[PDB]
């Protein structure tokens, strides 16, 4: 996230990096899938160096550089996230003993104890931009802060053994320890069904066009966003992937 070493001259080659208003004099990223490339003198690339959305650029797009320099530094542990709207943070549904556990800096709300995402107060008395609240959140700035766009307020910061067994597992297509959960039907991040017959966070679909039912275990954690996180297709949400999923979704050539 913070360590990016380059060799020689090149361009940025964002390859569809979502540029959003960053806190610094830069464009923040809201796209999970960011792939870079280096154009020294021809179309040949020198590295890919995929970076998360939390990265904030230090160089412009396509700018030639001498080399040996980072282009965008991101928190190795903290996961900075761009705010949906610019203005005061709208906090509601706060209950003592259920939404406040530790202490100012305090937890927003607990899903099990009770995700307030009403709106964001862009002005003093005008709001828009839903602030989804995952578990174990932290809020350090109260309402009326009137912060600028691009600020992050604790947006949840932070087998493959090479050899013959790996070759066999590849050939027999052994299922991974943590297959990535995919839903190619209206993939916009939502909330609900935290406690049902399935595990935590059972389902997370969106309307889109003809929504489908996708059970989600949410064993370790999630990879949800505010909105327009994913589009028609699927991306690796959590853990390694499985050949069957790629065959049934991405096609044959990708596999």
UniProtKB/Swiss-Prot annotation:
Co-administration of salinamide and rifampicin or salinamide and myxopyronin suppresses the emergence of resistance to both antibiotics. The modification N6-acetyllysine is found at residue 37. Acetylated on several lysine residues in the presence of glucose. DNA-dependent RNA polymerase (RNAP) catalyzes the transcription of DNA into RNA using the four ribonucleoside triphosphates as substrates. The RNAP catalytic core consists of 2 alpha, 1 beta, 1 beta' and 1 omega subunit. When a sigma factor is associated with the core the holoenzyme is formed, which can initiate transcription. The rRNA transcription and antitermination complex (rrnTAC) consists of RNAP, NusA, NusB, NusE (rpsJ), NusG, SubB, ribosomal protein S4, DNA and precursor rRNA; S4 is more flexible than other subunits. Belongs to the RNA polymerase beta' chain family. This is DNA-directed RNA polymerase subunit beta'. It comes from Escherichia coli (strain K12).
């Amino acid at each position: 996230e913070s360590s990016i070493q380059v060799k020689n001259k090149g361009s940025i080659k964002l390859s569809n990096v979502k540029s959003v208003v960053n806190s610094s004099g830069k464009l923040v990223i809201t796209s999970r899938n960011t792939e870079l490339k280096l154009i020294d003198e021809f179309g040949r690339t020198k590295e890919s160096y995929k970076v998360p959305y939390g990265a904030v650029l230090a160089k412009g797009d396509g700018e030639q550089v001498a080399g040996g320099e980072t282009v965008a530094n991101w928190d190795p542990h903290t996961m900075p996230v761009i705010t949906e709207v610019s203005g005061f943070v709208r906090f509601t549904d706060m209950i003592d003993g259920q939404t406040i556990t530790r202490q100012s800096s305090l937890v927003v709300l607990d899903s099990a104890e009770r995700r307030p995402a009403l709106k964001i107060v862009d002005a003093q008395g005008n709001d828009v931009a839903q602030y989804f609240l995952p578990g174990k959140a932290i809020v350090q700035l109260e309402d009326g802060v009137q912060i600028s766009s691009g600020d992050t307020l604790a947006r949840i910061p932070q087998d493959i053994t090479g050899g013959l067994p790996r070759v066999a597992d590849l050939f027999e297509a052994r299922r991974p320890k943590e297959p990535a959960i995919l839903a190619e039907i209206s993939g916009i991040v939502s909330f609900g069904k935290e406690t049902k017959g399935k595990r935590r966070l059972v389902i997370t679909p969106v309307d889109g066009s003809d929504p489908y039912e996708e059970m989600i275990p949410k064993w370790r954690q999630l990879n949800v966003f505010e909105g327009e996180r994913v589009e028609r297709g699927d991306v690796i949400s959590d853990g390694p992937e499985a050949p069957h999923d790629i065959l049934r979704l991405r096609g044959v050539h990708a596999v």
